[PDB]
Structure formats: structure tokens, C-alpha cells
């Protein structure tokens, strides 16, 4: 499993280093089916995690987010990128990773704002795993473009 996906194989290396550093990760996905696959992987490598996606009921949301923030044993939070509005605070996490990018820049921007916010203390680092030679690079361009239009007009 971990080698049949190039991203997953590279995420493994990165999570081992992050763990040994004592970093805490929000890890963002654009597909909840993948959220499931991963859920497995994390069980294998025996890391503690939470989950919040569009299936996660509202008071359960409150509960999970509060955990991640209360109890530092949890290393990864698996978050669906569009799920959860503005105003979930995860500033105990110091690392964000995007397993896959959105076509819309702002949705990834709003996602990393969950770490980078008032009351954050440590320096947030944002990984972005890109599969070279595939649609993922297309996406990344098309999104940097869009961000150029935002930069030109709303300045």
C-alpha cells in the first residue's frame, strides 16, 4: 500500500521526520475516500489521529476540534479541505500538509489559515505534495494563475 502511491510513499518519509521533530500536522484532502484509505495507513504506522469531513456532525465537529487542541497526543488531524467553515482554530498544529490541491487557491488558503492565525506561537510550515508529470502540476499552475489575477486586481 504505502509504495503503490508515490504521494503516500513520500508522505511516509515526511511524517516520520515530522513526528520525530514533535510537530503536529493538519493534513488536508480533497477526497474523503482517500481520507479513508489513509485512516488505514495511519493505523499501520500507529499514529494518533482525528478526522473532520463533511460527514462529521456539528457538535461532533466541535468535540473533535476541541480534542486536537486540548490533548497533544494527537499527531495528525485528517481534514477535508472544503469542510468546516472559517472559524475553526487549530493553532496548536504547526504543520500543514496538502495531500492534494484544490483548483481554487482560496480554499487551500482558508485551509492554512486554520494554523496561521492569532494565538499561534510556532512557525507554520506548509507542505504540498505534487506528483510530477501528472494533472497535479496542471492544477498547481492553474491555481497560481488564479492567484495572479487576485494579486493584480485586488491590490
Amino acid at each position: 500500500f504505502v509504495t503503490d502511491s508515490g504521494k503516500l510513499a513520500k508522505l511516509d518519509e515526511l511524517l516520520r521526520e515530522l513526528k520525530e521533530g514533535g510537530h503536529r500536522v493538519l493534513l488536508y484532502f480533497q477526497m474523503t475516500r482517500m481520507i479513508d484509505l489513509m485512516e488505514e495507513y495511519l493505523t499501520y504506522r500507529n499514529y494518533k489521529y482525528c478526522r473532520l469531513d463533511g460527514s462529521t456532525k456539528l457538535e461532533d465537529r466541535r468535540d473533535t476540534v476541541a480534542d486536537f487542541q486540548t490533548r497533544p497526543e494527537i499527531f495528525i488531524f485528517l481534514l477535508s479541505t472544503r469542510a468546516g467553515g472559517l472559524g475553526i482554530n487549530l493553532t496548536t498544529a504547526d504543520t500543514v500538509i496538502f495531500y492534494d490541491s484544490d483548483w481554487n487557491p482560496t480554499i487551500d488558503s482558508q485551509a492554512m489559515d486554520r494554523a496561521h492565525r492569532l494565538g499561534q506561537t510556532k512557525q507554520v510550515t506548509v507542505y504540498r505534495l505534487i506528483t510530477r508529470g501528472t494533472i497535479e502540476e496542471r492544477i498547481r499552475k492553474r491555481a497560481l494563475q488564479k492567484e495572479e489575477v487576485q494579486r493584480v486586481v485586488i491590490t
Partner: protein
């Protein structure tokens, strides 16, 4: 053949098991077991029976 190929592409890059995952298979079985009829009858307290016989029979 698949419809939304940009969606299909992203799935591949994520993990091939999004498509067709494997799962503890097993070797082929030649004998004659007993198939369960339905799921909605034997509710909670059921008993398994060793029903394994060979299809090769020898009649004496």
C-alpha cells in the same frame, strides 16, 4: 471506459486503491460447502457447521 478524466487523473495520483483495491483473497476451493441462504434470517445466535465435502465422491 471512464467519464470525468480529470477526476480520474487525480484519483490515480492519490492512490490506485481508489480504483480497485485488493483484499485477503485465498486459493480456489474444489469441494462442496454449504451456502448461507440470506442475511436477514440468522440474526444473532447462529452455529457454524463443518460442511466441507469433496465433490469427488466414491460410492460403495
Amino acid at each position: 471506459t471512464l467519464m470525468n478524466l480529470v477526476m480520474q487523473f487525480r484519483k490515480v495520483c492519490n492512490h490506485p486503491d481508489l480504483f480497485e483495491r485488493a483484499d485477503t483473497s485465498s486459493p480456489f476451493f474444489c469441494g462442496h460447502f454449504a451456502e448461507t441462504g440470506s442475511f436477514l434470517r440468522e440474526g444473532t445466535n447462529v452455529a457454524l457447521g463443518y460442511s466441507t465435502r469433496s465433490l469427488v465422491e466414491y460410492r460403495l
